């Protein structure tokens, strides 16, 4: 199994969360073969020498089986868009890793105005440009949620991954997903688990309902993924 | 005469490029190390947002050291609002930043390990690194509320208190980390002193020499009074690169008293421990030596901490709309500055950041000069570059 | 249609500690498990639903036996117990956490364990998951109208409430007892409960309820191996008094009737929503 | 030729906005017979007598050509739902008048906990239950925009109404439409018209880009309707 | 493909008043129209784009002639002029408002006039809509690099900037003149301009620009009746010098070139976006 970590306009936090499997990471790294990851390996090096220049480039390799793509795409940066179409072509399964890649996340707030690239202002999730097969929300998703994705993908546990594959079709995330889809639809019973999932503590249970402090939400989508009144696959009911 | 371009450079955080004028022999005569990552422009979309949102947002600069930006953010906002966090809140805050550095430095030694650690020692070496990072991440998770991006770092102090049990568990976890550190130091310092990679290549003695000074305000936390911001000036990439390369740089060019300055572990050891060794290897050595300073300081914080003491200040978040608050913090990779102006409503009027690596990038351009170009990336990695940080 | 979901064994039980029986709602299973775990190193923190002088609820992470006792008894209003599940493993530093909740709250707990996106370090610290039976719940102001306007008792004077024998009961600090037919409470119940397909907390380690067992006892369902070890440790230590359901009246038959009544009624509501176009979980 | 004003969970502000056409309301009311409006006319009255009580009820009539529906639907009120389904079956053209009816608007923030109906907490736009033909955003939409809706509806000007028929298919609006569709997609040029449209002054031009103060946005959809980089039909190019 | 959209007549023109010519960019058409309207009761307010010491723009509602003269001149940076269009009708109390903007900003106007959801009382008070030609625009920091880092002049010393003859120009307060090839400015231009399909502000009552006319004159496209009545009132009162574009050089031909090249170049960007999946106006 050839795995690759592609880094676009992210922060590497999702990669660090993968590294926070520690002992499971050594297990994981010997079952798959990490062929590309600019932060970890020296691949893929290609040299082209003329009479005036020596070009040592690190390109994306081919045969990539699963590509963990982290961060959003900057439309005003040619390299950023060249690499998101590159990863799709050279990979069979493309995983939007984290809210930045899956739904925009914090980069939704980007508006530009800051040197040194004053023209950079338009950031979109990778799903707005290429096909996404699986999507992991959160900022960052937990290491435990990561090992489950990787294990299911290697064991073909398509029943487990269904919730993320369905999630790959949606490119928008916000705390208002709890209101629009649960509170407003007369489905919220007030368990409070959505509040416990939030990384910024933007959710506050009041009158038995979640109350989103909008100026603290980073649009990571962890709360709407957690709500058992949105998605509740039957496989969860199986416990030992 | 010939040009050498290495892009992207590897085994560090982010997306950068090397542009090297070289002679017919491989020796670089003019060096240029620059960021090309797209600029997200955090500081600019924080304008108008409430002050409490700043540490939440700037934490997303980078996931390797998010604690460094939340800390500098709340220190700048507190300074602009004349807020004083309580004794025990400030202790917890420094403990949180140390825990993060306890995970970054071993992480960096894992990223450089392909060069210096032999193949047969790799698995044992990585197990030790991960054992150390586990303890460091445990501290950020328990004090900061999350291991990556800590919500408890707030304007006013720290949001939550730890229990006497969490405190004891942390202390004995630090004693374990201290033993792992002595084991790791024993192993790496001889290799860095050898100046020989694991394939046998002996690096030049003056590899990475540069003629620039250092900035550091504290060995483990930060002190805004040990620097005069008025003397910090950000210039454009045209001041350090040629025109055709300068239009590619994504960062600014920070100076102090009118000169480039290196930041990071060697800068701190120069200012507090009299460590004056130049070159790339000496940087690695200072970072390794620092692991011991960090864990010792953490245990000293645990002894002084009162788990029942106040951690959040009651002072309100109001400003005058004019004062330029200053918040500095010694991130893993060096002196890290955030600035903020807060109005009477508690909203952000102006915001700016001068991140650690940003200082280091123009030094690296001059530090690769004088050596063969196939050593350039070894000099780059010595500075533990975090480009998402440098660009933000 | 499966009445009770999966389980290992069902038994009528009550706590052995008599102080517990003086403050608990039915048999005191929830408190007896929490207290036994805290005192014998099996639990270092437990989630509870406390109340104030006006019966307003608050989820809380208890660490002492007295906190557990003060949280005993049922508050028939919505209390988000899972909202503190991360705080318990963060500042509180718990690593053997006890969880209690209605079936929908246990469901949310299994969801966050299977897909722990925003629950780093949380699932592997859940040592005991205790579910309670539930037919309906109420907003606070819903109960306040039931108690103060239909039963004629101020909230500050309420000592205990209970549902049973087709009536809602209010017991006063001053010895009074008042009851109203359960039909007069229906317009006040949280509508979102009309799509719930779980009456006996079918996904918990241990489930407990008043129905099926006599007054002062609880119908208890052992389900998982984690709840099996915990339950067997308690009965060995003598912390519980167990009688087979076959011997007690009304018996398991009532539990089957009520469970299937809830599943059949609310299934019409789910199909009704699908018909008009409203979303339902799946 | 038979207009009806249905009032669900609204404030009547949109009806007042209609009344503020003044001289033009008396041409609308002689061009069109107003068959139902509880605030305006006493129809349709029927008397139901049983052994116990005499019930004088006002019902929604049949044969409504245009139905202006104002306000959202409360899923916990039987009468509220009964009226939205009644208005659909008895009208040929159903118009979602205002943000409450079209996308929820302020009523998205409802969550309950307030006597005297402690169970009321779930409010959805009419489009979530019935098929909507045309949708007018805003809180309230201007009187000018109202006369253009009615004139074009009576004249069969489908080209003009196309933008509102397209809107009737969507039931979710906010200030975030501007960011996810214009700023993030490298379409925003900084005209500032969206800031001028906001009824709550929640949009503030900064660095030539709209900045949404989320704590002020009431999700009326006036800005995203205005943005010429979202919808710019060729009909606008014909001027005198 | 139509080059200039629909129009009635096209002339070369310039303000008759000499003080206007001293402060304006080209022929002073915008300032002469605003000043004539204010002084003869055809306008009571006009939207302008002002600048500070460092060239940062601010959209403003002006009501005096001196406010119009101080806003004269081109600032090649984004200024949201339409953001104050409701402000002028509201607090300023205007009822004969003059508007100015680049083609995209004139488009934003017609849009709010046709579908005035959030523009109660606004459209009927728009008395004159003046578009200026535009090929590209820039974010402020984009222009700041061009002036300070490519032309070597501080913004605080800039007196005027102009685009012409394949070059960008900076005129200094102290007499200096610096210029660069326009290829040095392309990387800094607002990328959302690469979908613009309007060069001569085709939807305005009156359009004006520098292309086609010599230095100190403007090409002026009259399009609507409203701009025809206004223009004719101006020439009658002698407020303008008018020459046919048929006698002046370079001439309309250069305008038809530039307009078409732009439409041809940016239509390719629109089709590029459509194929890769990015949204475009329609
Ligand atoms: C809303 C509701 C409806 C119920 N309906 C039924 C029913 O139809 N049939 C049936 O047999 N049993 C029902 N129960 C459970 C029953 O009321 C008893 O609480 C249960 O048998 C446990 O009592 P105990 O004496 O064994 O333990 P106890 O010692 O009495 O402790 C009870 C525990 O439950 C927790 N708790 C109390 N109120 C709430 C609340 N609102 N939300 C979450 N946790 C809470 C407390 O933390 C406490 O520790 C219901 C409970 C609730 C809250
Ligand atoms: C970014 C930009 C690009 C342009 N490109 C071209 C081009 O390629 N070809 C061409 O012929 N003309 C172009 N123009 C217009 C031209 O430069 C003159 O502005 C135009 O001829 C009007 O000048 P004037 O002397 O007739 O009127 P003036 O008396 O000089 O007054 C001009 C008016 O325009 C307004 N204004 C100034 N800057 C801005 C701005 N940034 N946004 C909105 N309004 C503003 C001011 O309020 C002022 O009242 C451009 C203008 C801009 C702002
Ligand atoms: N260490 C560190 Fe950062 Ni990722 C850098 N460079 C920030 O404060
Ligand atoms: S989702 Fe969060 S942690 Fe992951 S790359 Fe984006 S900002 Fe970093
Ligand atoms: S998780 Fe869903 S059902 Fe539970 S409180 Fe949150 S929004 Fe309501
Ligand atoms: S409320 Fe919290 S969990 Fe939900 S999207 Fe916002 S930040 Fe993420
Ligand atoms: S009836 Fe169902 S949804 Fe309502 S409180 Fe009980 S378990 Fe939860
Ligand atoms: S859209 Fe606005 S004016 Fe119309 S009913 Fe709703 S709140 Fe009232
Ligand atoms: S920003 Fe203003 S116009 Fe846009 S949805 Fe919010 S309230 Fe409506
Ligand atoms: S109307 Fe659209 S293009 Fe104009 S400023 Fe607003 S978002 Fe940008
Ligand atoms: S080029 Fe077009 S989109 Fe850009 S500023 Fe000019 S008129 Fe607006």
Author numbering:
A (entry chain L), D (entry chain I): 2 to 241
B (entry chain J): 2 to 393
C (entry chain K), E (entry chain H): 1 to 282
Sentences from the paper on this structure:
FRHs catalyze the reversible H2 oxidation coupled to the reduction of coenzyme F420 (8‐hydroxy‐5‐deazaflavin, ΔG°′ = −10 kJ mol−1). The overall reaction requires three components: the large subunit (FRHA) that harbors the [NiFe] center and oxidizes H2, and the small subunit (FRHG), which contains three [4Fe–4S] clusters to transfer electrons to the flavin adenine dinucleotide (FAD) located in the F420‐reducing module (FRHB, harboring an additional [4Fe–4S] cluster). FRHABG dimerizes and forms dodecameric assemblies of about 16 nm in diameter with a spherical shape and a hollow core. Here, by characterizing the native hydrogenase from the marine methanogen Methanothermococcus thermolithotrophicus (belonging to the Methanococcales order), we provided an unprecedented functional understanding of this enzyme via a synergistic approach of biochemistry, X‐ray crystallography, and spectroscopy.
Despite its sequence conservation with the two other structural homologs, we found that the [NiFe]‐containing FRH from M. thermolithotrophicus (MtFRH) exhibits a dynamic equilibrium between a dodecameric and dimeric state in solution, as highlighted by size exclusion chromatography and native polyacrylamide gel electrophoresis (PAGE). It was therefore not surprising to observe several crystalline forms containing either a dodecameric cubic organization (MtFRHcube) or only a single FRH dimer (MtFRHdimer1 −3). Based on the four X‐ray crystallographic structures obtained, we confirmed that MtFRH shares the basic organization previously observed with an elementary dimer of FRHABG heterotrimers that further builds into a dodecameric unit. Surface analyses through bioinformatics confirmed that the dodecameric state might be less stable in solution based on the structure of M. barkeri (MbFRH). However, considering the molecular crowding effect and the naturally high FRH expression (≈1% of total cytoplasmic protein), we propose that MtFRH forms a dodecamer of ≈1.2 MDa in vivo. The dodecameric assembly has been hypothesized to provide stability, protect redox centers, or keep the metal clusters at optimal distances. Nevertheless, the comparison of Fe‐containing MtFRHdimer2 and Fe‐depleted MtFRHcube does not reveal any structural rearrangement of the surrounding residues or the ones in the vicinity of the [NiFe] site. Therefore, the importance of the additional Fe site in modulating the redox properties of the [NiFe] center remains to be experimentally investigated.
